[PDB]
Coordinates of C-alpha atoms and ligand atoms in Angstrom, one line a residue:
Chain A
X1373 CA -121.1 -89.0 -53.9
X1374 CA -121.1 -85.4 -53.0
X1375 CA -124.8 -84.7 -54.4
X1376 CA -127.8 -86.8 -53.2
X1377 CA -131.3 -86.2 -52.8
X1378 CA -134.0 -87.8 -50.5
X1379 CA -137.9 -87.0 -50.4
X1380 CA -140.3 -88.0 -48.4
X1381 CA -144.1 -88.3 -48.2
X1382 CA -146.0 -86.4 -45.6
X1383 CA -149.4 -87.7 -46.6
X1384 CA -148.6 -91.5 -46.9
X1385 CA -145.6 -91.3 -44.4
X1386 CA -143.2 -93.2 -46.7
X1387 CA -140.1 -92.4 -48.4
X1388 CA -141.2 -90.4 -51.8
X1389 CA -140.5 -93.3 -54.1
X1390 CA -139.8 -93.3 -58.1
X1391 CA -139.7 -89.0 -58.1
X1392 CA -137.9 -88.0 -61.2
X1393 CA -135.3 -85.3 -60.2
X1394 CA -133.5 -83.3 -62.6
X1395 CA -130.6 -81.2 -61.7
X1396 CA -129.0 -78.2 -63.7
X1397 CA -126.4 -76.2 -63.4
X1398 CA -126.1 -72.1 -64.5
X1399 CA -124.4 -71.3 -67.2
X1400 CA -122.2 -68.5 -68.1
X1401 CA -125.6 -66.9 -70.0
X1402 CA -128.1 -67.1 -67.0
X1403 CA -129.5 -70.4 -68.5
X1404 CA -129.9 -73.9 -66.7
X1405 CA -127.7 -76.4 -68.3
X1406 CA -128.7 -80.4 -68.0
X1407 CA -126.2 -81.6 -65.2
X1408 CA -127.2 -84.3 -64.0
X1409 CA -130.7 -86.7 -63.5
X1410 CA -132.7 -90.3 -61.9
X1411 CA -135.8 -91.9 -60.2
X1412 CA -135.6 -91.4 -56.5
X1413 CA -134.8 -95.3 -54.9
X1414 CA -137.7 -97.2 -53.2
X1415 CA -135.7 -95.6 -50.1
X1416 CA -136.9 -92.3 -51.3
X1417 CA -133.2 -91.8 -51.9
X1418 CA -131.1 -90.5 -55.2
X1419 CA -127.1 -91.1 -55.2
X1420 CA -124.6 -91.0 -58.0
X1421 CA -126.0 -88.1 -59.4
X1422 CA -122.5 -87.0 -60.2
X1423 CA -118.6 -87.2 -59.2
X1424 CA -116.5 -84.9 -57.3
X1425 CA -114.5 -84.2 -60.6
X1426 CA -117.9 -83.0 -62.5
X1427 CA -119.6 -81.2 -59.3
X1428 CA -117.4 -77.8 -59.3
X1429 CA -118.5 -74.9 -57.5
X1430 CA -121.7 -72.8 -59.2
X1431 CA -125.4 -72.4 -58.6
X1432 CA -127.6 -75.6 -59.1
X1433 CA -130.8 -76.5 -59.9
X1434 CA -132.7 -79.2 -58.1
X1435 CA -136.1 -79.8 -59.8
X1436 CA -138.3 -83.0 -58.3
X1437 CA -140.9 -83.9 -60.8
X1438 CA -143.9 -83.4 -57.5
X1439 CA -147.1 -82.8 -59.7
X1440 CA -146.5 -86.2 -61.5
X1441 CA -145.9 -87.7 -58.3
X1442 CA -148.9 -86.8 -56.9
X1443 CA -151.0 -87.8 -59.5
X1444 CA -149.6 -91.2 -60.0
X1445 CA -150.7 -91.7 -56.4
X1446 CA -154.5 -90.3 -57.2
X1447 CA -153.9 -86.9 -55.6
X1448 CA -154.4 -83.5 -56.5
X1449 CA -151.5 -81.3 -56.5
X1450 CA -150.6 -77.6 -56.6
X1451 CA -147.3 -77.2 -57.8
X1452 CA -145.9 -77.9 -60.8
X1453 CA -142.7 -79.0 -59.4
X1454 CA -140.3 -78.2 -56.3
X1455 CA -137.2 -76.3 -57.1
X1456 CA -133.9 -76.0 -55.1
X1457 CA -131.2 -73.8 -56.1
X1458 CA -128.2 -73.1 -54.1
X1459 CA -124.9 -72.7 -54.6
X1460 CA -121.9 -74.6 -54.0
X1461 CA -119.5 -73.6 -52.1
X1462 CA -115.6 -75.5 -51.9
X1463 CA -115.1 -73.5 -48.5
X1464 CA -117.1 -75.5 -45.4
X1465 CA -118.4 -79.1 -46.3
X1466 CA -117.9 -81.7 -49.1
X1467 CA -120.9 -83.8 -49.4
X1468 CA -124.3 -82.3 -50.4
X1469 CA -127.8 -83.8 -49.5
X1470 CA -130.9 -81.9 -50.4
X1471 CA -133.8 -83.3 -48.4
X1472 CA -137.2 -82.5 -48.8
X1473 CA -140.7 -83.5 -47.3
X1474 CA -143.8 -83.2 -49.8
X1475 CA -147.6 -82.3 -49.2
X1476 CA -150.2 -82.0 -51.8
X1477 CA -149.9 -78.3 -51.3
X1478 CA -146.8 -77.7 -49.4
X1479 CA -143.3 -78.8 -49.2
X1480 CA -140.4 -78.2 -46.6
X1481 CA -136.8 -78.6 -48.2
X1482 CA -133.6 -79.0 -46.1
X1483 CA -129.8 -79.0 -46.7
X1484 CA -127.2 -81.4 -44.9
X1485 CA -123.8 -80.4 -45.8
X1486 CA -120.9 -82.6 -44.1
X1487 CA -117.5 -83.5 -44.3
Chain B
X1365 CA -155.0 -61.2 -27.6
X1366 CA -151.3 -62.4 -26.1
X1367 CA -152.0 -66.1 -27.4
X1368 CA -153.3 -67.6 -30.5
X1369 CA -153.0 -69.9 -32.4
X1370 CA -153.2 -70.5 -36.8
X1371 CA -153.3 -73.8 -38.3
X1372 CA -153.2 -74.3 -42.2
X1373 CA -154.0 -77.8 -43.8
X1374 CA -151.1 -78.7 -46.6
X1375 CA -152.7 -81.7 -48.1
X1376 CA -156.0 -78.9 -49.2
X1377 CA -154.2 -76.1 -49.0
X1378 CA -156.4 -74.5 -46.7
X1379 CA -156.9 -72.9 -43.3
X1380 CA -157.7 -76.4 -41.0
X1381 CA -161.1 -75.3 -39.3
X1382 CA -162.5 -76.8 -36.2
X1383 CA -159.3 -77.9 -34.7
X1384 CA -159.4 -78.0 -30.8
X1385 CA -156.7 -76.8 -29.1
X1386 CA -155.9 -77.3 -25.4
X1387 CA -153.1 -75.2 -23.5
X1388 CA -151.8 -76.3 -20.4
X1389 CA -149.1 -74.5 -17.9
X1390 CA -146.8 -75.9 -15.1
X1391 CA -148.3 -75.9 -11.7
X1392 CA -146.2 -75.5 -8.7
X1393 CA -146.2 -79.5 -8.4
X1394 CA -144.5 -79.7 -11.8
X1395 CA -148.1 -81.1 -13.2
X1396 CA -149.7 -80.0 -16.4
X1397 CA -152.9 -77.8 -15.4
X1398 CA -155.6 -76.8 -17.4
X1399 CA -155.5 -73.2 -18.8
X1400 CA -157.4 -72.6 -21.7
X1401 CA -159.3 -74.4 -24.6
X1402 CA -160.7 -72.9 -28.0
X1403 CA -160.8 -74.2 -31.5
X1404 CA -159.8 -72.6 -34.9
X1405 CA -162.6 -70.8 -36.8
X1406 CA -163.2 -70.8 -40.4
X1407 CA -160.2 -68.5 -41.3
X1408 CA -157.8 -71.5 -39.1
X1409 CA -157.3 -68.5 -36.6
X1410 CA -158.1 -69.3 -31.9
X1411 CA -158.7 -66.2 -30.8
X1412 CA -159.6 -65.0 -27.2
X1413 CA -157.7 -68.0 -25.3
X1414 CA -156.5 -65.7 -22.4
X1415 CA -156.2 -62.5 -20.7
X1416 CA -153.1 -60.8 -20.4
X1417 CA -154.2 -61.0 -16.5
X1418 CA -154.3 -64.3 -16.8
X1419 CA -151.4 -65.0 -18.9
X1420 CA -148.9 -65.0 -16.3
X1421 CA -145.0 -66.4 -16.5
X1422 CA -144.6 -70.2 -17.0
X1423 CA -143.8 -72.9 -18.9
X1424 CA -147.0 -73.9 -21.3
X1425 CA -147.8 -76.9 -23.9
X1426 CA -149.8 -76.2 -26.1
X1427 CA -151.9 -79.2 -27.7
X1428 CA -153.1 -79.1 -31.0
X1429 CA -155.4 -82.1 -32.1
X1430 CA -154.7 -83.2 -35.1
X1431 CA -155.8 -86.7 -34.8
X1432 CA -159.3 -85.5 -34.3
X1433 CA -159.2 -82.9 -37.1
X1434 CA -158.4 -85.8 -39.3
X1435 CA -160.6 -88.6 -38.2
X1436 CA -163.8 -85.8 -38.8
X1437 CA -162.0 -85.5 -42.3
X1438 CA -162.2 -89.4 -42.4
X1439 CA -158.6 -89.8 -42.6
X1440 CA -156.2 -92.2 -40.2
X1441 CA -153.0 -90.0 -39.1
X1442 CA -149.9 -91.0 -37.7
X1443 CA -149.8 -88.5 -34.6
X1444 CA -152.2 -88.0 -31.5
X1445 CA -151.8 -84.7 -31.6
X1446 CA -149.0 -81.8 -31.7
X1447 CA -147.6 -80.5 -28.6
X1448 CA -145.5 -77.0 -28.7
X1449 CA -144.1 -76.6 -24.9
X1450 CA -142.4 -73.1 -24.1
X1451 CA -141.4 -70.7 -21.6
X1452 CA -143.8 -67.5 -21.4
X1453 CA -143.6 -63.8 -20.3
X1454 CA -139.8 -64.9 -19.2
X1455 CA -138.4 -61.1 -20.1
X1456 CA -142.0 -59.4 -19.3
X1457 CA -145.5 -59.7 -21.4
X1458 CA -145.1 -60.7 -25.1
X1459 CA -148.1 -62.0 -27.5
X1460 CA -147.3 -65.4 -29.0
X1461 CA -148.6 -67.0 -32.3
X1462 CA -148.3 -70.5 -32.4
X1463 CA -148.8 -71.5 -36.0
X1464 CA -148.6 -75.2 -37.0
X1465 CA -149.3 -76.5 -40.7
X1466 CA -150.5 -80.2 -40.7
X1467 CA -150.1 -82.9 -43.2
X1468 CA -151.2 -86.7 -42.0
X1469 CA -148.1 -88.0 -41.3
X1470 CA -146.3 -84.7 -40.5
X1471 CA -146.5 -80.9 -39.2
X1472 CA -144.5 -78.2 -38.7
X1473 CA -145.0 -75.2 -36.2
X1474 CA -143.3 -71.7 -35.4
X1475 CA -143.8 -69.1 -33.2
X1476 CA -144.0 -65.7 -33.8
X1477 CA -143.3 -63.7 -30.3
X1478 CA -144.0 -60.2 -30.5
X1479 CA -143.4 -57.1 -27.9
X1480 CA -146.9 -54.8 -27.7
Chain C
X918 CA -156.1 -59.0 -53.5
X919 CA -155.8 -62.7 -55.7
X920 CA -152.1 -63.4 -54.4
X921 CA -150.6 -62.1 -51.4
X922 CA -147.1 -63.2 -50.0
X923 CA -146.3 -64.3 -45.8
X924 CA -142.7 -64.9 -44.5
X925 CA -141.9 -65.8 -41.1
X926 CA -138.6 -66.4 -40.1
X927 CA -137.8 -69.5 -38.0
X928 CA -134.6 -68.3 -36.1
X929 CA -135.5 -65.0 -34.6
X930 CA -139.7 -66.0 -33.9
X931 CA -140.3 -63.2 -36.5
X932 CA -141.9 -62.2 -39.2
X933 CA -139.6 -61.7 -42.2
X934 CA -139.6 -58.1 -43.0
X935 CA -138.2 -56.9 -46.1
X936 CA -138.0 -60.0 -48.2
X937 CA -137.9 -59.0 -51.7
X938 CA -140.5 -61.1 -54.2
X939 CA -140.4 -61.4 -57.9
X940 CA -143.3 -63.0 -59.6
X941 CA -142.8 -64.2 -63.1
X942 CA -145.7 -65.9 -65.3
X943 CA -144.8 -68.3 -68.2
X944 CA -145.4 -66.7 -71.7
X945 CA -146.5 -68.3 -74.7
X946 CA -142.9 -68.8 -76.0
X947 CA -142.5 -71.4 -72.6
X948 CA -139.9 -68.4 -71.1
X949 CA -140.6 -66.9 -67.3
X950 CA -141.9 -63.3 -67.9
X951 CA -141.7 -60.6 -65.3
X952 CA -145.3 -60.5 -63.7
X953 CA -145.0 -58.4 -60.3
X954 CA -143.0 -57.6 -57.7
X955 CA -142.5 -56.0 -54.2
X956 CA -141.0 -56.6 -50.7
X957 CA -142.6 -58.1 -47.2
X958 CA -143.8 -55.2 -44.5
X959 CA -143.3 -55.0 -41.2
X960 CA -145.8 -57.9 -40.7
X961 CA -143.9 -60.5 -42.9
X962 CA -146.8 -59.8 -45.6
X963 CA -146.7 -58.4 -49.1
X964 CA -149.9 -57.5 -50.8
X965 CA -150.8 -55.2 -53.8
X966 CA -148.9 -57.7 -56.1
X967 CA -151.2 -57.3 -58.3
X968 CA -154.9 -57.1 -59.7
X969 CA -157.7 -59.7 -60.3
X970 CA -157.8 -58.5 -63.5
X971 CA -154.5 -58.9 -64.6
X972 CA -154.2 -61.8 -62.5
X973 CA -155.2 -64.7 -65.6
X974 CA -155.0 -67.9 -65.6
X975 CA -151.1 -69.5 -66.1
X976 CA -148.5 -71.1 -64.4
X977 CA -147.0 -68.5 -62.0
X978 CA -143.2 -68.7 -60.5
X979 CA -143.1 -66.8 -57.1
X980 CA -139.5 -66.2 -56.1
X981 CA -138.9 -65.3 -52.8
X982 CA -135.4 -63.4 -52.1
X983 CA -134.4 -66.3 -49.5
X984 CA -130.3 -65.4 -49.9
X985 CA -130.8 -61.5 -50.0
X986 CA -132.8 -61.5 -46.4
X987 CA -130.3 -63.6 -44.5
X988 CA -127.2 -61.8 -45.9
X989 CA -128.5 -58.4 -44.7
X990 CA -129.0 -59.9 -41.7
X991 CA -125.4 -60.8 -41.6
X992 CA -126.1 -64.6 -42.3
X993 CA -125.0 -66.6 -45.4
X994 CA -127.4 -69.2 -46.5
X995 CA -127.5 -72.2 -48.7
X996 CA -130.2 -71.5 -50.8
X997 CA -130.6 -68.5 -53.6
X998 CA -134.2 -67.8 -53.2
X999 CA -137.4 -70.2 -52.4
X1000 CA -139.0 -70.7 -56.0
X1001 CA -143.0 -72.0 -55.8
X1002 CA -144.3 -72.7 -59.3
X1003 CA -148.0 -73.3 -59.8
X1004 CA -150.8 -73.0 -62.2
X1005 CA -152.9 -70.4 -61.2
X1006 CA -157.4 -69.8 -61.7
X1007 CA -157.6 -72.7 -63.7
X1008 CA -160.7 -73.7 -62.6
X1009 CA -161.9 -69.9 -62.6
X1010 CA -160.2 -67.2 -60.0
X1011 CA -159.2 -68.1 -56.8
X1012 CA -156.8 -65.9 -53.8
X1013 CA -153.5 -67.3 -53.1
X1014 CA -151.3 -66.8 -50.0
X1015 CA -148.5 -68.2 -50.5
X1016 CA -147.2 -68.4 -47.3
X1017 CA -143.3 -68.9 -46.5
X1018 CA -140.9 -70.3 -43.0
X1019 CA -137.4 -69.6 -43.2
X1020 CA -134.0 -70.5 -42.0
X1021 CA -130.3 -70.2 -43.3
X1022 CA -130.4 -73.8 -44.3
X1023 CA -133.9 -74.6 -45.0
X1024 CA -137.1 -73.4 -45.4
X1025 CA -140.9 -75.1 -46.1
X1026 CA -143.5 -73.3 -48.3
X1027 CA -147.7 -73.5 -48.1
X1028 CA -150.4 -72.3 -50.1
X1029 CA -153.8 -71.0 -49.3
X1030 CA -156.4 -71.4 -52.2
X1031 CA -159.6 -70.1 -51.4
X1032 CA -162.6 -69.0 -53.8
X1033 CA -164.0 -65.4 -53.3
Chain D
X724 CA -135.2 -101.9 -35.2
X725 CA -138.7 -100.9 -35.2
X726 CA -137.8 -97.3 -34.0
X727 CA -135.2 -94.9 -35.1
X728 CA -134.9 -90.8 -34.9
X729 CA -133.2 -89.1 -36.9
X730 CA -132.8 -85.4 -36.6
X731 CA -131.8 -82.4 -39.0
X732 CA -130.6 -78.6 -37.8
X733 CA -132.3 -76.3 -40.2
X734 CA -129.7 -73.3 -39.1
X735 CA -126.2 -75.1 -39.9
X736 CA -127.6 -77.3 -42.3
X737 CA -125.8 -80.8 -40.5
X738 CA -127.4 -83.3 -39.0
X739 CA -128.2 -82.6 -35.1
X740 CA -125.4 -84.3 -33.5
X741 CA -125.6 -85.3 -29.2
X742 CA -129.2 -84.2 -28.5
X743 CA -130.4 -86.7 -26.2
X744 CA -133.9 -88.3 -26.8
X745 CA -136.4 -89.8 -24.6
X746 CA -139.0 -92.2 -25.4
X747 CA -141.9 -92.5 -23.3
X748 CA -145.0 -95.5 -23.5
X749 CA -148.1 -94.4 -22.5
X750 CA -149.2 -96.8 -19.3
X751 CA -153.0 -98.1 -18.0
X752 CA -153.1 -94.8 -15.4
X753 CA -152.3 -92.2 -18.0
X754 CA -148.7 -91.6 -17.3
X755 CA -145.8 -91.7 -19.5
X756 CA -143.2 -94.6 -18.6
X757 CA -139.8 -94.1 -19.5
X758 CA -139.2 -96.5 -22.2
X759 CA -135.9 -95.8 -24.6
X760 CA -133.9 -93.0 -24.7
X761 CA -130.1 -91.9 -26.5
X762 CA -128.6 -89.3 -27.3
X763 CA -127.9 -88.6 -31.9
X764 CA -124.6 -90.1 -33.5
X765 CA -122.7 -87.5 -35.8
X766 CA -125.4 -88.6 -38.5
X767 CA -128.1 -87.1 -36.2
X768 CA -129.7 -90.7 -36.1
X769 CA -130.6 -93.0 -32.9
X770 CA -130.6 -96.4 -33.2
X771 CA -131.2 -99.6 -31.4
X772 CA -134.1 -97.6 -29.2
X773 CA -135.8 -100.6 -28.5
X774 CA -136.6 -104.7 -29.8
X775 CA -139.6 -105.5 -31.7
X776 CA -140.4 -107.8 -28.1
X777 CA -140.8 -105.0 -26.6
X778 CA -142.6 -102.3 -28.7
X779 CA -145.7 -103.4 -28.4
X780 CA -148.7 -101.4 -29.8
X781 CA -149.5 -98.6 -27.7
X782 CA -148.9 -94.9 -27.3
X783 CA -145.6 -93.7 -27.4
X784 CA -143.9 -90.2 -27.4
X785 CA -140.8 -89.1 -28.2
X786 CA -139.0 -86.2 -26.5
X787 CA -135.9 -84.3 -28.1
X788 CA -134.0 -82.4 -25.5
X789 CA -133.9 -79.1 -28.3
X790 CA -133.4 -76.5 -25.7
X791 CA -130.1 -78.6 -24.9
X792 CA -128.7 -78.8 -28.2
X793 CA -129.2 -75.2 -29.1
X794 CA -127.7 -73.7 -25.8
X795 CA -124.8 -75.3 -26.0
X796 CA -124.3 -74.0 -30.0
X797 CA -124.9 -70.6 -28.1
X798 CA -128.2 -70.2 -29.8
X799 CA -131.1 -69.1 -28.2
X800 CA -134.6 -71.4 -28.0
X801 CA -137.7 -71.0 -28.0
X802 CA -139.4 -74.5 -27.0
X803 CA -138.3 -76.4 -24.1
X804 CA -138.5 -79.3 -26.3
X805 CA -139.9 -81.3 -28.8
X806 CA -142.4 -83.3 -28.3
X807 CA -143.4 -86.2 -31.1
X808 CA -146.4 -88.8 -29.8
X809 CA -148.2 -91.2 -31.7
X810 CA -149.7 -94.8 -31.9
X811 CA -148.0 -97.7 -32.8
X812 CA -150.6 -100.0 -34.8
X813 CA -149.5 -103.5 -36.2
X814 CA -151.6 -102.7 -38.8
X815 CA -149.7 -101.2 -41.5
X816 CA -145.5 -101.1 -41.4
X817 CA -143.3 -102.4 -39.4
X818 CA -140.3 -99.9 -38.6
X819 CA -141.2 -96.3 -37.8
X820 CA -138.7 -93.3 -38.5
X821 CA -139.5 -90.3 -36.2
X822 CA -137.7 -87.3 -38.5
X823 CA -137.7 -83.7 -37.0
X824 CA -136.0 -80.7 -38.3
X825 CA -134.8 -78.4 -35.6
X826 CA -134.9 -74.2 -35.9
X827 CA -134.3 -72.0 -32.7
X828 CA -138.4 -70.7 -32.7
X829 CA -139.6 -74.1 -35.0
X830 CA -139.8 -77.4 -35.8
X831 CA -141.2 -79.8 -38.7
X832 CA -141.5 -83.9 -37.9
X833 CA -142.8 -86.6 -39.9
X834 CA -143.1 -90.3 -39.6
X835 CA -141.4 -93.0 -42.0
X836 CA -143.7 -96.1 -41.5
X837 CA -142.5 -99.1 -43.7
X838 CA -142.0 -102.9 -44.1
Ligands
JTN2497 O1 -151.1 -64.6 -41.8 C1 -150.3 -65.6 -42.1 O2 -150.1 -66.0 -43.2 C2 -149.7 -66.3 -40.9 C3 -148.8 -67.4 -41.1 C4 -147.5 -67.2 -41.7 C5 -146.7 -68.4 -42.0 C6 -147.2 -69.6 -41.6 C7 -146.6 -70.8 -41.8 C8 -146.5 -71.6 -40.7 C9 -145.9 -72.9 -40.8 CL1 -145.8 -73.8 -39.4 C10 -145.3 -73.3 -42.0 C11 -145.4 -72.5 -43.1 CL2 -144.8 -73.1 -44.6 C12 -146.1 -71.3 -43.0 C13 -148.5 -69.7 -41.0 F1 -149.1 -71.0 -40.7 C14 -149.3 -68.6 -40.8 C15 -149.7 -65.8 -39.5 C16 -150.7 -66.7 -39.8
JTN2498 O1 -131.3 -89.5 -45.4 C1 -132.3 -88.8 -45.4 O2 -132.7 -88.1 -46.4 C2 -133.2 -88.7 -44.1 C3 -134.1 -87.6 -43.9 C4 -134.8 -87.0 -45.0 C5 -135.7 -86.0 -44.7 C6 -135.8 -85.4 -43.4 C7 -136.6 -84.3 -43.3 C8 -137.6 -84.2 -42.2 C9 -138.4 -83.1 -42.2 CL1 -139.7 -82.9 -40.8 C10 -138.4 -82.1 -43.1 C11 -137.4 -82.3 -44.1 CL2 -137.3 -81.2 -45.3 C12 -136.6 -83.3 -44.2 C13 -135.0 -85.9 -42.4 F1 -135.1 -85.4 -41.2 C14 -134.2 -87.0 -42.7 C15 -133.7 -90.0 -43.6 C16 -132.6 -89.3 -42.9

């Protein structure tokens, strides 16, 4: 699993359960290309996103699906989505976890990169 | 103005008006003394807090009550309040802005430290 | 001034000075066009985007150059840039800040809606 | 466990590995008793803080050592420490997560209250 994703709730202090989170990847034209997609876990928590063998070095594209969050909850939101795009890098660590904490109108992201 | 202090609300996405805010500093006896008291106005912003007289070395915590701020929104948070504790004036007189953004379950703060 | 731009930075207690902003506004063929752009002062702020005229109602991508700050600071960083995407004076105009915290590794974003 | 930590460093991008972490209950006088305390795993997480027998309702706060942990990266702090405090309440979930993300001049926490 070197890709997971885990979002959390900063208004209902859960995990950030049943977010749809689409990852792409950049193509050789400046365009996103599908890579890879799920429904974050009732642990706020999205793994097997993708294989070492598929995850090759390149800038990605983490989109969580926040606005349609929020209003399946009842709330109000301002962003359409959140959007995390980093590259990956073989030198330094092997496993990849983009975290994130969402707000109505804010949202904090994080990276954990480890062995 | 060497201290104040901003607070933004991120479930309105507004400036969070009304909040108290208490500061404290280390007394000789290692207890938490009373030093100054405000709340944010309508732009979020505590001015006039202290003096740069007054604002002397020390350790300080400042309190920032968010549980108040959302009970008179009608809302049940998860903390009793925020607490940013720091060292002051250690390298000579600097103006501080403690900024904090508040969701219920969650906040963040920085400081922005700054040499006149 | 409908949308402004803050950016502290998290690691030197600072505002971010010099962070380059590109603003883009979905066209009617669903692609990001080139809106406005400019680059944080001395004070971590960037105003003069643009106009309330030109400022219409859309969906908005602000881009903040997260990746070109830290590296000419010396620092590699994880992300590219900090993307916020939101639709904009839907219910009639508003002011945005859109207000920014960074670090190499991380960074949280706020807004600040308020009606004239 | 009805109380974990777990605890994120915004400038490497790892978890926040040996900062030590002090738990304090709130007593009749006003004081803080020492309650729990342990210092983050390599996954930045502290478990086995305490037994559901003996986290009663109550105030509680949690202190992370941050000044600590970021001298002895050779980083220079701003906060002598963090400070988290908060009521437990039966009503509602059972197991809290306390969840800070560490910078040199901030920090971000949030609460993960479920089952
Ligand atoms: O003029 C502005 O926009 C200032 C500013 C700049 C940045 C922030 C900010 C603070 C936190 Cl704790 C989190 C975020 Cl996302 C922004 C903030 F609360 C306030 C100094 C108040
Ligand atoms: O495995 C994960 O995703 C966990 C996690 C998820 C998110 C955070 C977190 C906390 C804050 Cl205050 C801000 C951000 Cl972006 C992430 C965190 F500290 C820890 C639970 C450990």
């Amino acid at each position: 699993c070197p890709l997971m994703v885990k979002v959390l709730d900063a208004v209902r202090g859960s995990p950030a359960i049943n977010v749809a989170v689409h990852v792409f990847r950049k193509a050789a034209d400046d365009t996103w290309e599908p890579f890879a997609s799920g429904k974050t876990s009732e642990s706020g928590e999205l793994h097997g996103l993708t294989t070492e063998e598929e995850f090759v070095e390149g800038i990605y594209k983490v989109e969580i699906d926040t606005k349609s969050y929020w209003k399946a909850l009842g709330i109000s939101p301002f962003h359409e989505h959140a959007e995390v795009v980093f590259t990956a890098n073989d030198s330094g660590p092997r496993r990849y976890t983009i975290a994130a904490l969402l707000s109505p109108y804010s949202y904090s992201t994080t990276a954990v990169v480890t062995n």
